[PDB]
Amino acid sequence: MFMINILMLIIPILLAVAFLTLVERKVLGYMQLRKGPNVVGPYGLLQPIADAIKLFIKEPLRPATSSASMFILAPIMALGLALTMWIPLPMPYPLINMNLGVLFMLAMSSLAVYSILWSGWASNSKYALIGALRAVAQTISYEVTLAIILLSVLLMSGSFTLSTLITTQEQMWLILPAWPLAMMWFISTLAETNRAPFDLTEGESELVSGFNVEYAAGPFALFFMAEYANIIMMNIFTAILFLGTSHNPHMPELYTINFTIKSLLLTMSFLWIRASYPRFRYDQLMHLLWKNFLPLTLALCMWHVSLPILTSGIPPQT
Template sequence: MLMLLIFINFLFLFLMVLMSVAFFILLERKVLGYIQLRKGPNKFLLKGIFQSMGDGLKLFFKEVNYPNNMNFFLFLFSPILGLLISVFFWFIYPYIGLNFLMSFGLIFMFCCSSFMVYIFLLISWSSNSNYSVLGMIRFISQMISYEVSMMIIIINLMFLINSFNLNDFYIYQINIKFFFFCFLLFFMLFISFLAEMNRSPFDFSEGESELVSGFNIEFSSFSFVFIFMSEYMSIMFMGMLIFEMFFGLMMSKFYLNIFILFFMFLVIWLRGFLPRFRYDKLMYLIWKLILPLSLFLFIFNFSIQLFNLYH
């Protein structure tokens, strides 16, 4: 009976996240439309509310293109595997209460995040296209670089709670929020999330003027839908994660959802008014600024932990 409840719990969570992705895409198109002084989707059914669902159905029924000399098995299943890994991220979210059993939720998140690198490598390599491989090299070098800083920053926060359980951030922030004395970590983690999720101004894997969609150039129909949904599910998860770690809103799920919506709007707003960085400046930002700062804070926090342990 317990296993059945857990299965229903995760199935319902999966369906709700998929529906949220559809409305997130609609929100992005509407906000970008108003930023660019146009309306955005406003015709399909009720004022364009179901536009994303119509676009999804259209993509699912489009013809699938299979490049010559591709690896058919990897080409077909790597986007599906990428979507599943994005769903696994949400397993550490305590939806009904059964998910509280994951005491090492952040370690599980690190494993899933690292595994996504291999998924994108398989996606680009399976199509046997030089253009997708060039886009993959750019994207993976960016993703690995910012993933290092992201993990070090989260470990810095874990020093404050001495736990790997995401729910403990709520317990330690009942009276005071980490955001007010860890603002530098919040800002660096936000930048790392934007680069990790390939969002503007760090969207180098899909630089339209340079790469023509980058690593997923050969994908169409449902394969492209899975890659697209995986990216947007990760954005919503990162919004949940950053506001839980710095504001401790896990138990107050209504306020957490409001903050996730604010994070989604902020990501869209940044896309609307910031130009794309140069790639060399992106790497300069991580290797010469964010990573040294996060390592310094890591050594500082580790020294304090050792001092408290022996005194």
């Protein structure tokens, strides 16, 4: 009954990712005064299936100069780690209930970076290498700010357990006492997922396709699936972190409905932002985080350390 539970998690994720690509193409279409897919299936509903089948019957390529083992390893890590990020999510019950779910996701997200570094490096081509080193730059920009932003929020929750964030937000969303952190967190998730305006490791208009320019067919699809699975997961995490849904233990489906709507809307906002802004220069991303978010995050970290003590609002360990 646990293996069935695992399949009830990852198969829907791959279906949600498939239809997220359709929803992105439609939403950007209408914001761009056009329609987007509406021929392949009614309202384009069969488009993701056609794209999936086409890629997996397309010829994969191993570049002559590439490092074979790392070339193939890199897409497997990308999808493997993207799905691993979902096992601790309380929806409202996690598949795996971790004491330190917040830190587990931080560690896995750091490991998922290497699927970019090694794919770009193993490709042994210049555009792939340039994209890979942008990933190094991008991680340096957001990782320090991201962890300290989380720490400030967890000082009101009192735990690293993701399920405790549900209990913390039983009377009120944490976005009220921490909207300055929610703002910087929301930006950090765009940088963390290589999403526009921080889509730099791929950066179509500068690097052709960046770190995965040499990938084709199925191996390319794994990277694309991993990206969109990370988009949804990070918006679920944002919803749990700042827009806590009340949980009724006798009607857990009602949590899952309200919780899903919030995550969809947050994911829709990622598409909305992509349609609205130009791309950052990747040294301007580093300065944004280090010169703006970091000084403010450090100050808010001290503030949220002190605030529970001075207001006598320290949460419990459980």
